[PDB]
Tab-separated table of C-alpha atoms in Angstrom:
chain	number	residue	atom	x	y	z
A	511	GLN	CA	105.972	78.136	118.859
A	512	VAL	CA	105.522	77.876	115.121
A	513	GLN	CA	104.441	81.028	113.613
A	514	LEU	CA	103.083	82.586	110.057
A	515	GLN	CA	103.852	85.951	109.109
A	516	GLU	CA	101.958	86.959	106.155
A	517	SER	CA	104.247	89.905	103.343
A	518	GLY	CA	101.330	91.892	101.500
A	519	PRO	CA	101.257	94.936	98.833
A	520	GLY	CA	99.426	96.986	101.076
A	521	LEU	CA	98.438	98.274	97.991
A	522	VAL	CA	97.015	97.044	94.704
A	523	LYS	CA	95.412	99.070	91.156
A	524	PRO	CA	91.828	97.461	90.611
A	525	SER	CA	91.877	95.446	87.479
A	526	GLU	CA	96.242	94.417	88.773
A	527	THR	CA	97.368	91.127	90.507
A	528	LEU	CA	97.770	90.866	93.391
A	529	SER	CA	101.262	89.310	95.140
A	530	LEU	CA	101.561	87.986	98.747
A	531	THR	CA	103.466	85.515	100.976
A	532	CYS	CA	103.252	83.236	104.217
A	533	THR	CA	106.858	82.089	105.950
A	534	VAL	CA	106.562	79.866	108.956
A	535	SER	CA	109.125	79.102	111.030
A	536	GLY	CA	109.433	76.930	113.948
A	537	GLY	CA	108.440	73.983	112.512
A	538	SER	CA	108.262	72.848	108.880
A	539	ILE	CA	106.136	72.644	105.899
A	540	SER	CA	106.677	69.331	104.662
A	541	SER	CA	103.820	66.630	105.819
A	542	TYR	CA	101.149	70.069	105.905
A	543	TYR	CA	98.663	71.260	104.670
A	544	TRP	CA	98.683	74.893	103.583
A	545	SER	CA	96.183	77.223	103.455
A	546	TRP	CA	95.554	80.830	102.283
A	547	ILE	CA	91.978	82.536	103.837
A	548	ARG	CA	90.837	86.176	103.563
A	549	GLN	CA	88.619	88.735	105.309
A	550	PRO	CA	86.528	91.234	103.315
A	551	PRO	CA	85.314	94.640	105.828
A	552	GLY	CA	82.900	94.119	108.452
A	553	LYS	CA	81.902	89.962	106.966
A	554	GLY	CA	83.101	86.480	107.540
A	555	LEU	CA	85.534	84.175	106.657
A	556	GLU	CA	86.173	83.277	103.555
A	557	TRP	CA	88.377	80.319	102.660
A	558	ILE	CA	90.158	80.935	99.743
A	559	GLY	CA	91.811	77.224	98.790
A	560	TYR	CA	94.673	75.097	100.023
A	561	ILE	CA	97.988	73.269	99.101
A	562	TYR	CA	99.624	69.798	100.518
A	563	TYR	CA	104.071	70.566	100.822
A	564	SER	CA	103.680	67.628	97.666
A	565	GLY	CA	101.939	70.787	94.829
A	566	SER	CA	97.771	69.282	94.903
A	567	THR	CA	96.498	72.824	94.878
A	568	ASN	CA	92.451	72.614	96.499
A	569	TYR	CA	90.732	75.494	95.816
A	570	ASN	CA	87.021	77.848	97.097
A	571	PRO	CA	85.187	78.179	93.220
A	572	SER	CA	83.447	81.128	92.971
A	573	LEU	CA	87.939	82.024	93.325
A	574	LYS	CA	89.684	79.005	91.271
A	575	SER	CA	89.616	81.810	88.183
A	576	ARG	CA	91.980	84.635	89.229
A	577	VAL	CA	93.906	82.174	92.032
A	578	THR	CA	96.785	80.261	92.515
A	579	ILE	CA	98.829	79.158	94.902
A	580	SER	CA	101.797	78.043	95.398
A	581	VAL	CA	104.769	75.663	97.875
A	582	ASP	CA	108.527	76.541	97.791
A	583	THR	CA	109.696	73.712	100.872
A	584	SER	CA	113.738	74.796	99.714
A	585	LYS	CA	111.912	78.049	101.918
A	586	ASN	CA	109.240	77.187	104.505
A	587	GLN	CA	106.922	79.619	102.695
A	588	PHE	CA	103.907	79.212	99.798
A	589	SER	CA	102.478	82.398	97.589
A	590	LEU	CA	99.161	83.470	97.254
A	591	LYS	CA	98.423	85.002	93.434
A	592	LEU	CA	95.373	87.197	92.520
A	593	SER	CA	94.160	87.985	89.284
A	594	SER	CA	92.019	90.916	87.670
A	595	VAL	CA	92.115	92.138	91.014
A	596	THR	CA	88.391	94.181	92.341
A	597	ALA	CA	86.924	95.869	94.471
A	598	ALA	CA	85.791	93.348	96.045
A	599	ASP	CA	89.268	91.389	97.019
A	600	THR	CA	90.255	94.151	99.478
A	601	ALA	CA	90.200	92.080	103.094
A	602	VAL	CA	93.079	91.109	105.416
A	603	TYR	CA	94.550	87.804	103.710
A	604	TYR	CA	95.202	85.091	106.391
A	605	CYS	CA	97.504	82.328	105.851
A	606	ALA	CA	97.377	79.144	107.738
A	607	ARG	CA	98.523	75.428	108.553
A	608	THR	CA	96.406	73.133	107.816
A	609	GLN	CA	95.927	69.507	109.406
A	610	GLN	CA	93.951	66.893	107.418
A	611	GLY	CA	91.830	64.460	109.511
A	612	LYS	CA	90.276	61.282	108.874
A	613	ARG	CA	87.511	59.557	111.231
A	614	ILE	CA	87.180	55.531	110.332
A	615	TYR	CA	83.280	54.824	111.463
A	616	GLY	CA	83.522	51.729	110.429
A	617	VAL	CA	85.824	48.763	108.448
A	618	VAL	CA	88.493	50.656	107.197
A	619	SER	CA	88.054	48.030	103.735
A	620	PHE	CA	84.493	49.231	103.044
A	621	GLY	CA	84.877	52.695	102.758
A	622	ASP	CA	82.931	53.944	105.519
A	623	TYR	CA	85.260	56.169	107.154
A	624	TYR	CA	86.046	60.130	105.831
A	625	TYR	CA	88.651	62.970	105.552
A	626	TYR	CA	88.563	65.895	107.035
A	627	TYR	CA	90.492	69.690	107.493
A	628	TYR	CA	90.798	72.401	109.522
A	629	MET	CA	93.705	74.943	110.412
A	630	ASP	CA	95.456	74.753	113.980
A	631	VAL	CA	97.927	77.687	113.753
A	632	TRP	CA	97.191	81.051	111.314
A	633	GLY	CA	99.481	83.523	110.715
A	634	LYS	CA	98.453	87.449	111.822
A	635	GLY	CA	96.962	88.316	108.661
A	636	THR	CA	97.435	91.649	105.751
A	637	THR	CA	95.525	94.300	105.144
A	638	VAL	CA	94.684	94.296	100.749
A	639	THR	CA	93.216	97.990	99.875
A	640	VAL	CA	92.692	97.957	95.896
A	641	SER	CA	92.568	101.745	94.485
A	642	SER	CA	93.834	103.953	92.269
A	643	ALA	CA	94.999	105.955	94.132
A	644	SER	CA	98.879	105.942	95.484
A	645	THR	CA	101.291	105.361	98.704
A	646	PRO	CA	102.804	109.385	107.220
A	647	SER	CA	104.120	112.111	108.988
A	648	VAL	CA	104.619	112.238	112.419
A	649	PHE	CA	105.227	115.061	114.925
A	650	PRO	CA	106.053	114.721	118.793
A	651	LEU	CA	102.653	114.519	121.259
A	652	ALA	CA	105.364	116.237	123.971
A	653	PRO	CA	104.673	115.822	127.857
A	654	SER	CA	103.183	118.651	129.694
A	655	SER	CA	101.911	119.517	133.313
A	656	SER	CA	98.434	112.914	135.767
A	657	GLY	CA	99.169	112.215	139.260
A	658	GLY	CA	102.769	111.237	138.524
A	659	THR	CA	101.581	110.116	135.644
A	660	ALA	CA	103.309	111.250	132.820
A	661	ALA	CA	101.832	111.053	129.144
A	662	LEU	CA	103.232	111.031	125.732
A	663	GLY	CA	102.244	110.617	121.982
A	664	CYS	CA	103.246	110.171	118.305
A	665	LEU	CA	101.104	111.817	115.799
A	666	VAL	CA	101.246	109.951	112.790
A	667	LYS	CA	98.680	111.340	109.734
A	668	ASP	CA	98.188	112.121	106.209
A	669	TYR	CA	99.559	108.130	105.291
A	670	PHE	CA	97.155	105.931	102.689
A	671	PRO	CA	96.626	102.475	102.931
A	672	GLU	CA	96.650	101.356	106.428
A	673	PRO	CA	97.969	99.941	108.581
A	674	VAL	CA	101.847	101.637	110.612
A	675	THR	CA	102.677	99.951	113.706
A	676	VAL	CA	104.494	101.631	115.752
A	677	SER	CA	106.783	100.934	118.360
A	678	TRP	CA	108.507	102.407	120.970
A	679	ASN	CA	112.305	102.474	121.824
A	680	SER	CA	112.670	99.874	119.521
A	681	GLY	CA	110.389	97.958	121.016
A	682	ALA	CA	111.682	97.666	124.330
A	683	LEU	CA	109.599	99.863	125.704
A	684	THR	CA	106.275	97.960	125.580
A	685	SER	CA	104.679	98.743	129.178
A	686	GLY	CA	101.862	101.896	129.507
A	687	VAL	CA	101.763	102.887	125.664
A	688	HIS	CA	98.615	102.576	123.788
A	689	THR	CA	98.836	102.769	120.395
A	690	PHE	CA	94.935	104.017	118.603
A	691	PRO	CA	93.204	102.377	115.841
A	692	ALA	CA	93.683	104.995	113.015
A	693	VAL	CA	90.206	107.873	111.952
A	694	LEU	CA	89.462	107.381	108.347
A	695	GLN	CA	89.527	111.114	107.188
A	696	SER	CA	87.173	112.983	104.763
A	697	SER	CA	90.370	113.145	102.595
A	698	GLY	CA	90.747	109.259	102.861
A	699	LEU	CA	93.786	109.347	104.210
A	700	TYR	CA	94.687	108.531	107.813
A	701	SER	CA	95.157	108.969	110.894
A	702	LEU	CA	96.642	108.111	114.109
A	703	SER	CA	98.504	109.172	117.447
A	704	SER	CA	100.479	106.583	119.676
A	705	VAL	CA	100.599	107.403	123.321
A	706	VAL	CA	103.167	106.260	126.309
A	707	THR	CA	102.042	107.424	130.209
A	708	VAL	CA	105.814	107.252	131.433
A	709	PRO	CA	105.971	108.014	134.897
A	710	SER	CA	105.885	111.807	135.589
A	711	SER	CA	108.934	111.265	138.024
A	712	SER	CA	112.512	112.533	135.958
A	713	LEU	CA	110.470	112.282	133.281
A	714	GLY	CA	113.277	113.958	132.434
A	715	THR	CA	117.400	112.463	131.756
A	716	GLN	CA	114.799	109.935	130.320
A	717	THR	CA	114.547	109.060	125.931
A	718	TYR	CA	111.407	108.402	124.865
A	719	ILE	CA	111.635	107.493	120.888
A	720	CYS	CA	108.605	106.471	118.817
A	721	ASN	CA	109.104	103.133	116.263
A	722	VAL	CA	106.603	103.958	112.726
A	723	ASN	CA	106.318	101.652	110.244
A	724	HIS	CA	104.682	101.107	107.270
A	725	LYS	CA	105.410	98.914	104.912
A	726	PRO	CA	102.999	100.149	101.782
A	727	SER	CA	105.766	101.837	101.562
A	728	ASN	CA	108.708	100.713	103.331
A	729	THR	CA	109.548	103.753	105.880
A	730	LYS	CA	110.538	103.160	109.134
A	731	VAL	CA	110.577	106.329	111.138
A	732	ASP	CA	112.159	107.449	114.401
A	733	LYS	CA	110.651	110.276	116.696
A	734	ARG	CA	112.438	111.987	119.678
A	735	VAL	CA	109.707	112.913	122.024
A	736	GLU	CA	110.463	115.564	124.763
A	737	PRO	CA	108.449	118.375	126.936
B	346	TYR	CA	76.733	72.406	102.157
B	347	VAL	CA	74.840	74.785	104.626
B	348	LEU	CA	75.798	76.748	108.645
B	349	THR	CA	73.695	77.680	109.708
B	350	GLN	CA	74.469	79.899	112.663
B	351	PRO	CA	72.909	82.975	114.186
B	352	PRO	CA	74.257	85.784	113.838
B	353	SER	CA	74.276	86.769	117.605
B	354	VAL	CA	74.420	85.561	121.453
B	355	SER	CA	74.607	87.556	124.077
B	356	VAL	CA	74.759	86.582	128.066
B	357	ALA	CA	75.370	87.643	131.449
B	358	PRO	CA	78.848	87.351	132.831
B	359	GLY	CA	79.488	83.852	134.822
B	360	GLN	CA	76.437	82.375	132.202
B	361	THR	CA	76.948	80.013	130.078
B	362	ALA	CA	76.727	80.895	126.684
B	363	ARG	CA	75.450	78.305	123.829
B	364	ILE	CA	76.528	78.333	119.715
B	365	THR	CA	74.547	76.498	117.792
B	366	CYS	CA	76.074	75.115	114.554
B	367	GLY	CA	72.188	74.108	112.098
B	368	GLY	CA	73.224	71.269	109.146
B	369	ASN	CA	71.405	68.846	107.631
B	370	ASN	CA	72.531	65.146	109.773
B	371	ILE	CA	75.985	67.550	111.068
B	372	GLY	CA	76.652	64.993	113.445
B	373	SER	CA	78.047	62.484	110.891
B	374	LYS	CA	80.018	65.464	110.463
B	375	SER	CA	83.240	66.988	111.867
B	376	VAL	CA	82.467	70.091	113.110
B	377	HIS	CA	85.274	71.955	114.062
B	378	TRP	CA	84.872	76.013	116.340
B	379	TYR	CA	87.137	79.173	115.983
B	380	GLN	CA	87.364	82.264	118.139
B	381	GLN	CA	88.007	85.849	116.377
B	382	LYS	CA	87.840	88.859	118.977
B	383	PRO	CA	87.949	92.391	117.875
B	384	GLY	CA	90.475	93.169	115.812
B	385	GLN	CA	92.336	90.078	115.609
B	386	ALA	CA	93.325	87.060	113.851
B	387	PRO	CA	91.250	83.610	114.019
B	388	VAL	CA	92.289	80.698	116.763
B	389	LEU	CA	91.324	77.636	116.612
B	390	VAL	CA	89.759	76.811	119.750
B	391	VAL	CA	87.784	73.541	118.675
B	392	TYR	CA	88.696	70.730	116.714
B	393	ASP	CA	86.576	67.138	115.231
B	394	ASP	CA	83.450	67.838	117.355
B	395	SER	CA	85.433	67.940	120.385
B	396	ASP	CA	88.506	68.118	120.622
B	397	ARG	CA	90.636	70.387	122.270
B	398	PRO	CA	93.229	72.322	120.723
B	399	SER	CA	97.008	73.267	123.206
B	400	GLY	CA	95.722	76.401	125.450
B	401	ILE	CA	91.599	76.517	125.490
B	402	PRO	CA	90.276	76.723	128.363
B	403	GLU	CA	88.356	73.616	130.181
B	404	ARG	CA	85.708	76.758	129.713
B	405	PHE	CA	85.304	75.992	125.742
B	406	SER	CA	83.482	73.117	125.207
B	407	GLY	CA	82.186	71.858	121.998
B	408	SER	CA	79.815	68.380	121.358
B	409	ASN	CA	77.663	68.138	117.727
B	410	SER	CA	74.805	65.067	117.541
B	411	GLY	CA	72.016	65.367	115.100
B	412	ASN	CA	71.465	68.151	113.404
B	413	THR	CA	73.308	70.696	115.344
B	414	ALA	CA	76.277	71.500	116.963
B	415	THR	CA	76.815	73.085	119.746
B	416	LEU	CA	80.044	75.279	120.869
B	417	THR	CA	78.914	75.785	124.785
B	418	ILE	CA	80.919	78.169	126.779
B	419	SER	CA	80.807	78.189	130.633
B	420	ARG	CA	81.715	80.969	133.165
B	421	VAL	CA	81.869	83.801	130.164
B	422	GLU	CA	83.883	86.514	130.936
B	423	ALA	CA	83.974	89.851	129.085
B	424	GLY	CA	87.202	88.138	127.788
B	425	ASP	CA	85.466	86.096	125.535
B	426	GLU	CA	83.022	88.503	123.477
B	427	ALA	CA	83.782	87.578	119.774
B	428	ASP	CA	82.685	85.596	116.463
B	429	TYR	CA	82.426	82.209	116.807
B	430	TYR	CA	82.402	80.446	113.137
B	431	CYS	CA	81.898	76.609	112.271
B	432	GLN	CA	83.656	74.909	110.572
B	433	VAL	CA	82.702	71.881	108.223
B	434	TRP	CA	84.372	70.082	105.494
B	435	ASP	CA	82.331	68.345	103.009
B	436	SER	CA	83.951	65.915	100.519
B	437	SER	CA	80.084	65.687	98.401
B	438	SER	CA	80.541	69.592	97.323
B	439	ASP	CA	81.902	71.768	95.088
B	440	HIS	CA	82.535	74.502	97.525
B	441	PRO	CA	84.145	70.997	99.912
B	442	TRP	CA	84.854	74.337	102.378
B	443	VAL	CA	82.047	75.772	104.320
B	444	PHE	CA	82.418	78.361	107.580
B	445	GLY	CA	78.682	79.133	109.456
B	446	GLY	CA	77.780	82.594	108.456
B	447	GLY	CA	79.869	83.780	112.416
B	448	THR	CA	78.523	84.201	115.515
B	449	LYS	CA	78.555	87.544	117.565
B	450	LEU	CA	79.080	86.686	121.787
B	451	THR	CA	78.089	90.237	123.981
B	452	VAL	CA	78.432	90.132	127.261
B	453	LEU	CA	75.935	91.951	129.176
B	454	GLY	CA	76.245	93.475	131.870
B	455	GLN	CA	80.014	94.533	132.442
B	456	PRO	CA	80.848	97.406	134.878
B	457	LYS	CA	80.178	100.813	133.991
B	458	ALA	CA	84.339	102.170	133.344
B	459	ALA	CA	84.696	106.387	133.041
B	460	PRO	CA	86.412	107.983	130.048
B	461	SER	CA	90.224	109.239	131.338
B	462	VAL	CA	90.236	112.109	128.207
B	463	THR	CA	94.016	113.263	127.255
B	464	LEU	CA	94.324	116.382	124.467
B	465	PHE	CA	97.447	116.882	123.045
B	466	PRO	CA	98.063	121.077	121.295
B	467	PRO	CA	99.612	121.427	117.025
B	468	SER	CA	103.383	120.065	118.036
B	469	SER	CA	106.008	122.829	117.814
B	470	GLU	CA	106.687	120.573	114.496
B	471	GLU	CA	104.212	120.600	113.155
B	472	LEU	CA	103.336	124.554	113.384
B	473	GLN	CA	106.828	125.283	110.670
B	474	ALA	CA	104.273	123.018	108.291
B	475	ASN	CA	101.522	125.641	108.612
B	476	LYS	CA	99.264	122.994	109.542
B	477	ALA	CA	98.212	121.892	113.559
B	478	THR	CA	95.637	119.721	114.851
B	479	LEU	CA	94.760	118.907	118.075
B	480	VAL	CA	94.483	115.575	119.050
B	481	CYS	CA	92.297	114.388	121.882
B	482	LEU	CA	92.782	110.639	122.960
B	483	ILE	CA	89.802	108.628	125.278
B	484	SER	CA	89.866	105.775	127.217
B	485	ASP	CA	89.484	103.328	129.651
B	486	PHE	CA	85.429	103.796	128.803
B	487	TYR	CA	82.422	101.249	129.078
B	488	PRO	CA	79.751	100.976	127.739
B	489	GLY	CA	81.755	101.915	124.500
B	490	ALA	CA	79.302	104.868	123.689
B	491	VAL	CA	80.531	108.793	123.732
B	492	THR	CA	79.738	112.298	122.158
B	493	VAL	CA	82.497	115.064	121.399
B	494	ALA	CA	81.824	118.247	121.839
B	495	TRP	CA	84.941	120.962	120.552
B	496	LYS	CA	84.879	124.222	121.528
B	497	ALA	CA	86.328	127.418	120.495
B	498	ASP	CA	87.510	129.913	123.623
B	499	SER	CA	83.577	128.986	125.219
B	500	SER	CA	82.302	128.331	120.938
B	501	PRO	CA	81.643	125.274	119.797
B	502	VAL	CA	83.070	123.568	116.535
B	503	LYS	CA	81.963	121.834	113.717
B	504	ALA	CA	84.878	122.213	111.323
B	505	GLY	CA	86.934	119.931	110.952
B	506	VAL	CA	86.099	117.867	113.195
B	507	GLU	CA	87.527	113.512	112.971
B	508	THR	CA	86.525	110.996	115.133
B	509	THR	CA	86.594	107.533	115.473
B	510	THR	CA	84.228	104.964	116.063
B	511	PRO	CA	84.975	103.539	119.983
B	512	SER	CA	86.632	99.853	119.402
B	513	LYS	CA	87.736	97.656	122.400
B	514	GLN	CA	91.694	97.264	124.934
B	515	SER	CA	92.793	94.555	126.403
B	516	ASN	CA	91.315	95.262	129.228
B	517	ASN	CA	87.802	94.852	128.470
B	518	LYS	CA	87.086	98.580	127.643
B	519	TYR	CA	86.669	100.777	124.857
B	520	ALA	CA	89.231	103.498	123.066
B	521	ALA	CA	88.877	106.237	121.004
B	522	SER	CA	90.227	109.696	119.015
B	523	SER	CA	89.022	112.532	118.418
B	524	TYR	CA	91.374	115.479	115.724
B	525	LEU	CA	90.655	119.265	115.038
B	526	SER	CA	93.025	120.333	112.003
B	527	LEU	CA	93.211	123.784	112.320
B	528	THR	CA	96.171	127.111	110.968
B	529	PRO	CA	98.320	128.749	113.120
B	530	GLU	CA	96.867	131.182	112.413
B	531	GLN	CA	93.695	129.970	113.991
B	532	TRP	CA	95.324	127.920	116.723
B	533	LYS	CA	97.385	131.133	117.875
B	534	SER	CA	94.748	133.637	117.235
B	535	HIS	CA	92.442	131.300	120.706
B	536	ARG	CA	93.062	132.016	124.056
B	537	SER	CA	92.266	128.324	124.448
B	538	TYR	CA	89.958	124.975	122.970
B	539	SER	CA	87.998	122.212	124.454
B	540	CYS	CA	87.725	118.964	124.363
B	541	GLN	CA	84.310	117.564	125.842
B	542	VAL	CA	83.619	114.230	125.978
B	543	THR	CA	80.593	112.347	126.906
B	544	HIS	CA	80.166	109.213	128.674
B	545	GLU	CA	76.423	107.476	129.606
B	546	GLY	CA	75.071	110.997	130.971
B	547	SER	CA	77.934	113.068	132.594
B	548	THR	CA	81.116	115.022	130.844
B	549	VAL	CA	84.887	115.876	131.578
B	550	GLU	CA	85.861	118.585	129.028
B	551	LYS	CA	90.310	119.028	128.900
B	552	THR	CA	91.434	122.902	127.080
B	553	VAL	CA	94.704	123.438	125.926
B	554	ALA	CA	96.256	127.180	124.724
B	555	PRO	CA	98.786	128.238	122.694
B	556	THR	CA	102.075	129.455	124.455
């Protein structure tokens, strides 16, 4: 149960430095390689670089000039730094555990062998947006008079940039929860709504609390929903 | 080093899908496959030509020989729809790490499903902020294509309508949302409002009235 968790800013002004960090849990950074990968909207995957736990680095040449990867075994994280940031650096950024394999296909002493790398454990990703713009109003969507199944939710309007995550009842309520993907306003701002379907029977004497987290502004909001 | 992938492959459910990875003498290399479902992070499904990672269904089978590496998926399910990327590490290259362009797997012939629609009126809290927004939520539909029409007391409206693109749900159906902002002066003005969702030659309509 090794897990990898990316922490990002979500937003970075053009031509300043993007900083990322990946925290690994249920495992050690030691004896392993550690890679950063990114995916521009609608595009394929692009490997950025790796770092051996000892410090040795290796980079995609197309980005080598601006990129810096470092490791910290004392905290089990490794970091990315991308300078002179541009609009083409907008992407989801992944951190992934990297394995080094070796195929000995002949005599190991005639150099009849080679090494290879692959990524077996990935992080969840973190959205990086490059905009000059700066950086979420939550309103209750109250249940109303669906056959014993009742729908209520939270409306999250006018935030920037992506993403926001919503939990219900501090993560205790997970069934029937359907958080819809956000709209891109003409204004350019983002808006989503999250909805949970609960039993209509005894809808009262039941508390429903949507917990909205918007990391790019360090805001954690709770909102109670009742008829 | 160049990895050539077809941009898309289609299969009927239960059939076998074959995603190929072209390369020059690629059989002399270790090929690894990644699966990326919509909205999700990639996962390793094959490493070193044919090795199965922990938890990867026996339906997935990697193979590599000659100038083509192949990811075979037997008994394909709707949930297998994803982008599949082959990957290699070619030591003798300025670009040592290579990804394939990616192959989109689409499962054709899935069962039709009618949209469920839920229309919320402007909240009691939003109206004191002199803002008013109608939220229309569309879910559980397939194919993932719907047209949305808003009506203001039997009168179609185009102004202030923001609709999303359909996204895939975990149950391999689709969801989409449509928004209509108004003034409280506009909201309380009319006797009702209607979100009208057309799907596959049929329409579901929901109506809300101020009180």
